[PDB]
């Protein structure tokens, strides 16, 4: 496969800025969701899930085709709970029907991050909806009960190195796990709706205990009442991972820079941008626009 990016006919920056602004305004208004967490975390997770199905070997999956919209991918067990992000975006799509799906789903994750005070994430338009048949089978998303080796190996399929893996996982500071969705329960820190390097600090500073949960799965629990999945814990078991965790616990900036690049790469994987495509856009937050 070759997935060339094709800009939505006749739209420019300003058009995209408006879709961004609509998502952002709705994030603000629907602040009750998940006990006051808001939808930010879930959008972030949706954007990662539609992008994580990519396979560097044959170029299948990835954000391109917006296949999440199809039954198969939508009903993927690893996708349980994402339907709420979907439902949240639907009205937006209805208002701006010329945006493709992969573009919409991906822009929500970007909007979410920047609106939760994260770093700016450059973003490119151009994804094109593909047919139901381009939909990847389930089982391409990672399990949570493994270790560092597993994680290393898995991410490799997406071309991500150690530094990218560690940066990207710091998104685990957002939201929380939900029993019903994944068989895991609890938040990972205190600031679960603001973007910070809290994840790294908690892994390093808490006194984690391994326990089973009501779903009969193991998780690392802290006295403060926080949790970490085995895959998150594994970041401190591997020596290479561990020094990067340390770097981030110590420098929020470094982390923000690295996350930003890694997030973009993740969202751009498998897509070919012609020389004449426009440069990546950098959207203003509602606040920078005084809205």
Number of C-beta neighbours around residue 147 at 10 A = 14
How far apart are alpha carbons 216 and 218 in whole angstroms? 7
- The mark string for 172-211 relative to ligand HEM (x by CB under 6 A, - otherwise) is x-xxxxx--xx-x---------------------------
Residue 130 vs 260, nearer CB to ligand HEM: 260
Task: Give phi and psi for 288, each to the nearest 5.
Answer: -75, -15
- Under the binding rule (CB under 6 A), the answer on residue 104 touching ligand HEM is no
Residue 183 vs 278, nearer CB to ligand NH4: 183
The residue nearest ligand HEM at its CB is 175
| Token representation of residue 275 | 């020389």
How far apart are alpha carbons 86 and 183 in whole angstroms? 21
What does 188 interact with, of ligand NH4, ligand HEM, none (CB < 5 to 8 A by kind)? Answer: ligand NH4
How far apart are alpha carbons 262 and 265 in whole angstroms? 5
Residue 24 vs 113, nearer CB to ligand HEM: 113
- Under the binding rule (CB under 6 A), the answer on residue 142 touching ligand HEM is yes
Residue 27 vs 228, nearer CB to ligand NH4: 228
In the chain, which residues are last before a break of more than 2.5 Å from C to the next N?
Answer: none
Residues 18, 283 contacting (CB under 8 angstroms): no
Which stretches of the chain bind ligand HEM, using CB under 6 A?
A: 41-42, 44-45, 48, 81, 142-144, 151, 168-169, 171-172, 174-178, 181-182, 184, 229, 231
């Amino acid at each position: 496969l070759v997935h060339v990016a094709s800009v939505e006919k006749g739209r420019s920056y300003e058009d995209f800025q408006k879709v961004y602004n609509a998502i952002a305004l709705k994030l603000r208004e629907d602040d009750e969701y998940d006990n006051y967490i808001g939808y930010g975390p879930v959008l972030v997770r949706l954007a990662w899930h539609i992008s994580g199905t990519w396979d560097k070997h044959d170029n299948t999956g990835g954000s391109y085709g917006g296949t999440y919209r199809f039954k198969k991918e939508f009903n993927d067990p690893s996708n349980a709970g994402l339907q709420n992000g979907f439902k949240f975006l639907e009205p937006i799509h209805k208002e701006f029907p010329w945006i493709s799906s992969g573009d919409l789903f991906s822009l929500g994750g970007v909007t979410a991050v920047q609106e939760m005070q994260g770093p700016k994430i450059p973003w490119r338009c151009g994804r094109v909806d593909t047919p139901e048949d381009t939909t990847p089978d389930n089982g391409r998303l990672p399990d949570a009960d493994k270790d560092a080796g597993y994680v290393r190996t898995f991410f490799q399929r997406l071309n991500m190195n150690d530094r990218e893996v560690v940066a990207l996982m710091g998104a685990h500071a957002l939201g929380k796990t939900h029993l019903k969705n994944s068989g895991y329960e609890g938040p990972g820190g205190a600031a679960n709706n603001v973007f910070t390097n809290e994840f790294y600090l908690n892994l390093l500073n808490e006194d984690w205990k391994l326990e089973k949960n009501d779903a009969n799965n193991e998780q690392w629990d802290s006295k403060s009442g926080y949790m970490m999945l085995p895959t998150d814990y594994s970041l401190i078991q591997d020596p290479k991972y561990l020094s990067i965790v340390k770097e981030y616990a110590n420098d929020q900036d470094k982390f923000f820079k690295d996350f930003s690049k890694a997030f973009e790469k993740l969202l751009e994987n498998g897509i070919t941008f012609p020389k004449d495509a426009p440069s990546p856009f950098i959207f203003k937050t509602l606040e920078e626009q005084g809205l």
